[PDB]
Design an enzyme around this catalytic site. Structure first.
Site, PDB file in Angstrom:
ATOM      1  N   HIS A  70       3.174  -6.307 -12.889  1.00  0.00           N
ATOM      2  CA  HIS A  70       3.853  -5.176 -12.251  1.00  0.00           C
ATOM      3  C   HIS A  70       5.296  -5.492 -11.846  1.00  0.00           C
ATOM      4  O   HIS A  70       5.988  -4.593 -11.355  1.00  0.00           O
ATOM      5  CB  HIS A  70       3.047  -4.626 -11.055  1.00  0.00           C
ATOM      6  CG  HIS A  70       2.897  -5.562  -9.886  1.00  0.00           C
ATOM      7  ND1 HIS A  70       3.969  -6.122  -9.222  1.00  0.00           N
ATOM      8  CD2 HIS A  70       1.792  -5.968  -9.217  1.00  0.00           C
ATOM      9  CE1 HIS A  70       3.528  -6.860  -8.217  1.00  0.00           C
ATOM     10  NE2 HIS A  70       2.210  -6.782  -8.190  1.00  0.00           N
ATOM     11  N   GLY A 122       7.087  -9.332  -0.951  1.00  0.00           N
ATOM     12  CA  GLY A 122       7.609 -10.455  -1.701  1.00  0.00           C
ATOM     13  C   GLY A 122       6.607 -11.551  -1.989  1.00  0.00           C
ATOM     14  O   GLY A 122       6.961 -12.539  -2.649  1.00  0.00           O
ATOM     15  N   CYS A 133       3.873 -11.366  -3.843  1.00  0.00           N
ATOM     16  CA  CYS A 133       3.138 -11.272  -5.099  1.00  0.00           C
ATOM     17  C   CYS A 133       3.474 -12.451  -6.005  1.00  0.00           C
ATOM     18  O   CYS A 133       4.590 -12.973  -5.996  1.00  0.00           O
ATOM     19  CB  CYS A 133       3.435  -9.949  -5.808  1.00  0.00           C
ATOM     20  SG  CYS A 133       3.006  -8.472  -4.830  1.00  0.00           S
TER      21      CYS A 133
HETATM   22  O1  LIG Z   1       5.680  -3.102  -2.292  1.00  0.00           O
HETATM   23  C1  LIG Z   1       6.116  -4.112  -2.849  1.00  0.00           C
HETATM   24  N1  LIG Z   1       7.424  -4.374  -2.871  1.00  0.00           N
HETATM   25  C2  LIG Z   1       8.345  -4.098  -3.965  1.00  0.00           C
HETATM   26  C3  LIG Z   1       8.319  -2.633  -4.345  1.00  0.00           C
HETATM   27  C4  LIG Z   1       8.661  -2.402  -5.795  1.00  0.00           C
HETATM   28  F1  LIG Z   1       9.900  -2.785  -6.101  1.00  0.00           F
HETATM   29  F2  LIG Z   1       7.852  -3.067  -6.621  1.00  0.00           F
HETATM   30  F3  LIG Z   1       8.570  -1.118  -6.139  1.00  0.00           F
HETATM   31  C5  LIG Z   1       5.196  -5.159  -3.485  1.00  0.00           C
HETATM   32  C6  LIG Z   1       4.681  -4.849  -4.899  1.00  0.00           C
HETATM   33  N2  LIG Z   1       3.455  -4.043  -4.952  1.00  0.00           N
HETATM   34  C7  LIG Z   1       3.124  -3.343  -6.075  1.00  0.00           C
HETATM   35  C8  LIG Z   1       4.103  -2.953  -6.993  1.00  0.00           C
HETATM   36  C9  LIG Z   1       3.750  -2.290  -8.159  1.00  0.00           C
HETATM   37  C10 LIG Z   1       2.418  -2.041  -8.426  1.00  0.00           C
HETATM   38 CL1  LIG Z   1       1.993  -1.220  -9.890  1.00  0.00          CL
HETATM   39  C11 LIG Z   1       1.438  -2.451  -7.532  1.00  0.00           C
HETATM   40 CL2  LIG Z   1      -0.237  -2.148  -7.842  1.00  0.00          CL
HETATM   41  C12 LIG Z   1       1.783  -3.106  -6.369  1.00  0.00           C
HETATM   42  C13 LIG Z   1       2.475  -4.237  -3.872  1.00  0.00           C
HETATM   43  C14 LIG Z   1       3.095  -4.439  -2.511  1.00  0.00           C
HETATM   44  N3  LIG Z   1       4.084  -5.510  -2.594  1.00  0.00           N
HETATM   45  C15 LIG Z   1       4.167  -6.628  -1.845  1.00  0.00           C
HETATM   46  O2  LIG Z   1       4.985  -7.506  -2.101  1.00  0.00           O
HETATM   47  C16 LIG Z   1       3.223  -6.785  -0.714  1.00  0.00           C
HETATM   48  C17 LIG Z   1       2.108  -7.563  -0.882  1.00  0.00           C
HETATM   49  C18 LIG Z   1       1.160  -7.758   0.190  1.00  0.00           C
HETATM   50  O3  LIG Z   1       0.133  -8.460   0.077  1.00  0.00           O
HETATM   51  N4  LIG Z   1       1.431  -7.124   1.356  1.00  0.00           N
HETATM   52  C19 LIG Z   1       2.532  -6.325   1.582  1.00  0.00           C
HETATM   53  C20 LIG Z   1       2.725  -5.717   2.827  1.00  0.00           C
HETATM   54  C21 LIG Z   1       3.828  -4.927   3.021  1.00  0.00           C
HETATM   55  C22 LIG Z   1       4.749  -4.726   1.998  1.00  0.00           C
HETATM   56  C23 LIG Z   1       4.567  -5.311   0.777  1.00  0.00           C
HETATM   57  C24 LIG Z   1       3.455  -6.135   0.536  1.00  0.00           C
END
Ligand SMILES: O=C(NCCC(F)(F)F)[C@@H]1CN(c2ccc(Cl)c(Cl)c2)CCN1C(=O)c1cc(=O)[nH]c2ccccc12
Ligand SMILES: O=C(NCCC(F)(F)F)[C@@H]1CN(c2ccc(Cl)c(Cl)c2)CCN1C(=O)c1cc(=O)[nH]c2ccccc12
Lengths: 306, 302
Positions: free
Chosen positions: B41, B143, B145
Site C-alpha cells: 500500500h 509511519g 507500517c
Molecule cells: O494512515 C497512514 N498514513 C499515511 C496515509 C497515506 F499516505 F497512506 F494515505 C498509514 C497507512 N495506512 C494505510 C494506507 C493505505 C492502505 Cl490501502 C491501508 Cl489498508 C492502510 C494505515 C495507517 N497508517 C499508519 O501508518 C498507522 C499504522 C498504525 O498501526 N497506527 C496508526 C495510528 C494512527 C495513524 C496512522 C497509523
C-alpha cells in the site's frame, strides 16, 4: 494506538557484550573502547564470599588470571583495576562497535532497558524501573551478572545499571557503571533484604494520561482536589508524595488531553479508594507505575483520540 | 528469578531496516540480500483506497518511482515486483548486515518480538502474541507500517510479521513476509473490524507454572479435574479448549513444578469462577495469556 512495555532497540549494546572468566567463575562484561567493565565479585571464591577483601583479592591477581572472549575472539588483558564495585580490564583492542555512550546514574522511579546476557551472549531485552527502594524487579538467572541497563537518546547509549545479585525476595540489585551500588546493598554474603517499597505516583498519573490518549476514559470524574488533600490519600495507600515539579512535568500530557493534573489526581484518589470494579485500564487490572511521563510521550500519539 | 515480557535482542533486525518512499508516502522496508520488502500500500494514493487495483497501480510505476534509503545511503532500485500484499524492490546492493533468516508464518497463540520503526529508524522493541482472531495488540503510530515481527533461534531470524494497518479497536493487522494477511483483513479502506477473540488457555496455564516457579502459590489447591470437565468451564469463560497435545506440551513445566496439568486446570477453574480476591500473580491482577510454554521455559530455566 496501543501501549506496551517498550524497550530501546538493543543492537548498540549487543555489540559490547563479552564474557569475563576468572578462575572457575564466568560472567558478562561490557566492552567499550579498550576497557571491559564487569562486577568485581568475579574475583571471589566460594570460600571468601561471606566477607571478601577485594583490595587483597585484586593485588593477588595478574592480567593472565582474566580471560575475556568477544564472540570467538580472545581479548588480551593488558591491565586491571577496581573502581568501587566494578572491575576494569584494559584490553589490547578497542571495540570497533563502541557506540557513543555516557555513564549516567538514574533516580528511583526512572525506567531503563535491560539486555539480559549469559556467557557474553544476549538472550532478551525488557523494560525495568528503579524502585523507590533501589531494587529492580528484573528477570535474571544464574550467569546473568554483568548484564547492563541503559537508555538511548538520539544515537547515544546512556548506561545506567550493571547487574550484581538477586535478593531473597527475588528482586535484583546492582551498581551504576562507576561501581556505586543503587541502594543499601553490598557485594558480599549477608542477610541483605530489600527495604519497604512505595508506588511511584507520578508514573501512575502518566499512565492514566496514556490511557486517556488511547481512549480509556471510564475512570475520569468531574471532581478535583488540592495537592495537599491528594497527598494525604497517597500516604494512606503507600504512594509517594506528589510535588509541584511532578505536576509541572505532567504539563504536556495535561495539555494534550485537556485534563488538569489535579483532576487526574482526583481520579486516582477514587481508584485507590474504590478499586476498578472488574474494569481494566490499558489492559491492566491494577495501577501500573513503571511508565515515566517520558515513556508515555515517547510511545503515545501526539494527538488525543477525541 | 523474576518474569518479564521479554523480547529477543533486536540488533540483527535493526541492521535490516530501511526507508521506502513512493510518491509522497514513506514507510519502512526490510532489506535482506538485494531485496527490500515493504507493504504494497505504499503505492496507494488518497483517492484510490476504497477499491485499489494494485496490479494497475504497479504497472504505472517504474524503478525510479521508488526511493530506498538505508540510513544516509540511497539504494538504487533495479527491479520491482509484487508478491501478494508485499512489494519486493530489487536493489543494486546486497545488505552486508543480512543475518541468517527464514520467512515463517506463525500460529494464533504464538508470540514474537516487534521492532517498532519510523522512517527506517528503529524506535522500540516489545513482545506480542498473535491473537486467536489474527490481530495483534501492538503499539504503533503513523509511519510504523513495514515494521516487522520476528523470533530468533540460535543465529537465525525467523521473520513472521510485517505491519500493515490499525483496526478501529486500536489493534493491528498485517501479513507474513510472503505478503499473506493474518486473518480476514485486506489492504484497502473498508469497515473491517477484529472478530470475536478468545483467551489462549495453554498460555494461561504456562504462565501459572511460571508463577509457581517464581514463588506465587496462593492459587494452588489439592483438587483436580478431568480434561472434559475443565473444557466445559473454558467454554463458559471464552477460553480455548485444552487438547491432549496442549497437556503434552505442558509436560516439562508440570514435571519441574510437580503440579499435574489437570491440577493446574483445577486452579484455573477456581480463578475463573472466584477471581483473585485482591491478590496478584507475577505482578498482574488478571490471567495473562501472551506467554507460551516455550517463553516460560526460556525465561524460567532455574
Ligand atoms: O494512515 C497512514 N498514513 C499515511 C496515509 C497515506 F499516505 F497512506 F494515505 C498509514 C497507512 N495506512 C494505510 C494506507 C493505505 C492502505 Cl490501502 C491501508 Cl489498508 C492502510 C494505515 C495507517 N497508517 C499508519 O501508518 C498507522 C499504522 C498504525 O498501526 N497506527 C496508526 C495510528 C494512527 C495513524 C496512522 C497509523
Ligand atoms: O551464583 C552465582 N553464580 C556463580 C558465582 C559463584 F558462586 F561462583 F561465586 C552468581 C553470582 N552471585 C554472587 C557471587 C558473589 C558475590 Cl560476593 C555476590 Cl554479592 C553475588 C550472585 C548470584 N549469581 C547469579 O548469577 C544470579 C543472578 C541473579 O540475578 N539471579 C540468580 C538466581 C539464581 C542463581 C544465580 C543467580
Amino acid at each position: 494506538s496501543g501501549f506496551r512495555k517498550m524497550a530501546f532497540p538493543s543492537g548498540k549494546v549487543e555489540g559490547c557484550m563479552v564474557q569475563v572468566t576468572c578462575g572457575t567463575t564466568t560472567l558478562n562484561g561490557l566492552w567499550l573502547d579498550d576497557v571491559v567493565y564487569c562486577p568485581r565479585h568475579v574475583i571471589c571464591t566460594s570460600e571468601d564470599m561471606l566477607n571478601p577483601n577485594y583490595e587483597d583479592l585484586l593485588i593477588r591477581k595478574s592480567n593472565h588470571n582474566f580471560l575475556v572472549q568477544a564472540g570467538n575472539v580472545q581479548l588480551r588483558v593488558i591491565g586491571h583495576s577496581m573502581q568501587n564495585c566494578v572491575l576494569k580490564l584494559k584490553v589490547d583492542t578497542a571495540n570497533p562497535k563502541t557506540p557513543k555512550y555516557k555513564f549516567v546514574r538514574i533516580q528511583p522511579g526512572q525506567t531503563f532497558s535491560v539486555l539480559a546476557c549469559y556467557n557474553g551472549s544476549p538472550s532478551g531485552v525488557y523494560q525495568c524501573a528503579m524502585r523507590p527502594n533501589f531494587t529492580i524487579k528484573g528477570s535474571f538467572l544464574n550467569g546473568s551478572c554483568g548484564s547492563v541497563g541503559f537508555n538511548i537518546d538520539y544515537d547515544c547509549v546512556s548506561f545506567c545499571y550493571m547487574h550484581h545479585m538477586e535478593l531473597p525476595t527475588g528482586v535484583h540489585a546492582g551498581t551504576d557503571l562507576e561501581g556505586n551500588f543503587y541502594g543499601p546493598f553490598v557485594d558480599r554474603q549477608t542477610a541483605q533484604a530489600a527495604g519497604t517499597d512505595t508506588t511511584i505516583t507520578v508514573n501512575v498519573l502518566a499512565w492514566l494520561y496514556a490511557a486517556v490518549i488511547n481512549g480509556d476514559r471510564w475512570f475520569l470524574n468531574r471532581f478535583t482536589t488540592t495537592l495537599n488533600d491528594f497527598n494525604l490519600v497517597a500516604m494512606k495507600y503507600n504512594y509517594e508524595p506528589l510535588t509541584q515539579d511532578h505536576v509541572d512535568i505532567l504539563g504536556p500530557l495535561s495539555a494534550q488531553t485537556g485534563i488538569a493534573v489535579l483532576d487526574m489526581c482526583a481520579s486516582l484518589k477514587e481508584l485507590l479508594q474504590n478499586g476498578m470494579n472488574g474494569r481494566t485500564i490499558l489492559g491492566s487490572a491494577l495501577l501500573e507505575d513503571e511508565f515515566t511521563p517520558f515513556d508515555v510521550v515517547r510511545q503515545c500519539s501526539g494527538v488525543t483520540f477525541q
